[PDB]
């Protein structure tokens, strides 16, 4: 189900997903100097029923001192959330790349990646993208 690796993280390029396939997990992590609330949740899970998909376990933090069938959307930011998000994607996930600010794309093809399943191992197709300043 889950992909045992992250996207290839092309240098000078970031990535994001338009929608998250059911089964995606978002770790509940907070800034420095803040901690996950006690008795809180470790991750949010994208679940769904015959007509809906939502996230399961709302995150929290405290001081340390249109829809698409079968997909969730971006969960809203929560207070004192970390600067980045950790996702645990599943096979059939599509992630699009984009050159970081200040760069430009030296190609005309699609900057897309997909988590495939073959021979018991899952890894993402190498994007055909190059970023140059």
């Amino acid at each position, epitope marked *: 189900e889950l992909c045992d690796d992250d996207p290839p993280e092309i240098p000078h390029a970031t990535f994001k997903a338009m929608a998250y396939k059911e089964g995606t997990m978002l770790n509940c992590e907070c800034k420095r100097g803040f901690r996950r609330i006690k008795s809180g949740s470790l991750y949010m899970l994208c679940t769904g029923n015959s*007509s809906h*998909s939502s996230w399961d376990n709302q995150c929290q933090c405290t001081s340390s001192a249109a829809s698409l069938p*079968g997909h969730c959307r971006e969960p809203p930011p929560w207070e004192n959330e970390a600067t980045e998000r950790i996702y645990h994607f599943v096979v059939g996930q599509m992630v699009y790349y984009q050159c970081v600010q200040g760069y430009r794309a030296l190609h005309r093809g699609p900057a897309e990646s997909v988590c495939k399943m073959t021979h018991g191992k899952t890894r993402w197709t190498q994007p055909q993208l190059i970023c140059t300043g």
Partner: antibody
Amino acid sequence: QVQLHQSGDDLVKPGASVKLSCRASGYTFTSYWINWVKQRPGQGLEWIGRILPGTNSIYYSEIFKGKASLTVDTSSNTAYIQLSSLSSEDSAVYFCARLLWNKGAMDYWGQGTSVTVSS
Amino acid sequence: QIVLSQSPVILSASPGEKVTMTCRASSGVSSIHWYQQQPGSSPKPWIYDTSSLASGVPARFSGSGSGTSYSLTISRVEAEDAATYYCQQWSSNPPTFGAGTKLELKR
């Protein structure tokens, strides 16, 4: 077994409006989406819109925005689609369908409702 | 919106022959569904998720593909297979169908 049954073949004049129905059976009506599809003679299928009976949620295709409207009557678990400003190109077979959510497919279809317009 | 193109438009295969059909997406999609519509009848689910042979379907059909190229294959044609097959995607809104590829028997 699930079953969807639609109205019979309807013939109407150009410029008028008509309502096509698709009564559901064999499953909970408000727990699933109902999709509408169009098939002009020898031209392939064409998705129209979505409607959830129990939540009053409606989505449309950019092509059909305003040319069709989806309504529901939860008392008799029947779905409706109303077509307005009918023209010569609107003659086709219309299917109601049920959305398999986790797969993003259609798992049950109606028998089709032919509609033709002529002078 | 994604455009799916199926070729060949009309395919003629002798019974017992192994044949393949292709649906090609303008932009990559996660999976493709397939339907079979006999004349004067509604479409019938055939292959979900490009590999999940739909329940009640003969085991002679199989599908596989990835990215922007997918294919529906028949191990051996039979009389019941005279119909048209449509590929579908819902990786983005709105969902789209192919133009259809008819199946005919040789003589």
